[PDB]
């Protein structure tokens, strides 16, 4: 439960431009509350904040090449979320993530085999 | 067998712009869909996972045999994906398919 | 003790690629080790001594170090280790006194390194 | 450019590849990240007089996931993170104020992905 | 204290389980064990003792070093240890570098065939 909102692209790559390679380009991104989900054209940049004010920030780069495999499960009903497995190379648990309302659901898993394989 | 126009149908939307369904088996009531770049293990109510393993994650692997049992091993990672590959599975051809798709 | 190829590659044809080829191969008792253009595959049968045999493929890339250990004894026996890449535990294979020890040692370095 | 690159390659001439060249560096206080071609070399000393000297170094090939996170009080700082291939915990750097981390950041980014 | 070993001599020794286009490049012999770069591994050479009759041959293709480090202790005290992390392997294979040793030409023989 909960929505991602859809990140306006253009300012993200003003804001994030500092920290992207030469040659990479955003090609979605989403916000829950305050963190992001950032689908590059290298990498997904996951953008997590931490207290009250928000200032313990971590920017994890995944690198697509490191997805060594991955999953969507459907959700069972309309009031759960499809969720996405995500297995990192060398991490032994997979990052799990909902594929909450508002994301398009088939868009990401697109980007991620356009991207992955 | 498996109606591969229907099903690159069903999984059109997912699949990688350069990418493209060449073959799938029947695992009981699960199956095994090959295309140009992964392994996709969809196993099933309204609830069906979606089980992607690019062919270049793939180490090795090994088939023993009666049923058979298939071990796909995984980059970075020590535990294989187990498949039990029950009398009636085409073995042979899932095997010729590994390595065609990953060799 | 000499493998016969030709017949290797009929057996094994209807699991080989298409563009697949067998090189090698050695006998270790009642096993086989296969050295293809792509792959090792260790064929492992008990035989007289039970119901399995396991067809295993380890590409070459996935071969990250590799060690033999002899016996200092009469014996002569050999033992490898093969570590494959994502496990840290060792594929290990006893190479009795007949096995050819130094040609499997030579064709794992020729095809994986 | 924080450091004589010149300079640099000339010092590290010695324990670099034939064709391996330098490409930038970064003074981590008294510490330094220099990139090549082909690695970054983290050159730490240790103790008052810097002595006791590390060059440990990290072929970009082998980086597998990295993260930048805020540290230290009031989040002044930050520490950075490398996975690297085939080890489940990451190399981590403090990366104290006054360091370039978002030029280092950058240059990770350009390098590794 | 390391003493270097001829490598035409080794290459005769070693030959039999060389790769076919594989050349020595450096090798170092502490009692009967040894420590051999060739262009393609590492090759890591255990006898027990002078005589124990077992040995243990230990190769590391340099693609499965997937980071090294070497550290010294001093300005003026030049002893060193590489520390040479192999994929898979969570702790580090430790090479002291002490009297014998051309800690520089190791360094950049690693450099050479690993990067
Ligand atoms: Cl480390």
Not at 44 to 58: E, F, H, Y
Not at 64 to 78: L, M, P, Q, R, S
Request: glycine share 8%; charged share 25%; net charge negative.
């Amino acid at each position: 439960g909960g929505n991602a909102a859809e990140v306006n692209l253009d300012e993200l790559a003003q804001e994030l431009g500092p920290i992207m390679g030469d040659n990479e380009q955003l090609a979605l991104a989403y916000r829950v509350i305050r963190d992001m989900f950032v689908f590059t054209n290298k990498r997904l940049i996951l953008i997590d904040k931490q207290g009250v004010t928000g200032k313990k920030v971590s920017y994890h780069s995944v690198p697509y090449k490191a997805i060594t495999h991955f999953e969507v499960e459907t959700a069972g009903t309309f009031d759960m979320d499809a969720e996405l497995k995500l297995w990192i190379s060398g991490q032994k648990d997979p990052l799990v993530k909902e594929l909450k309302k508002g994301t398009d659901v088939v868009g990401i898993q697109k980007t991620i085999a356009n991207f992955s394989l």
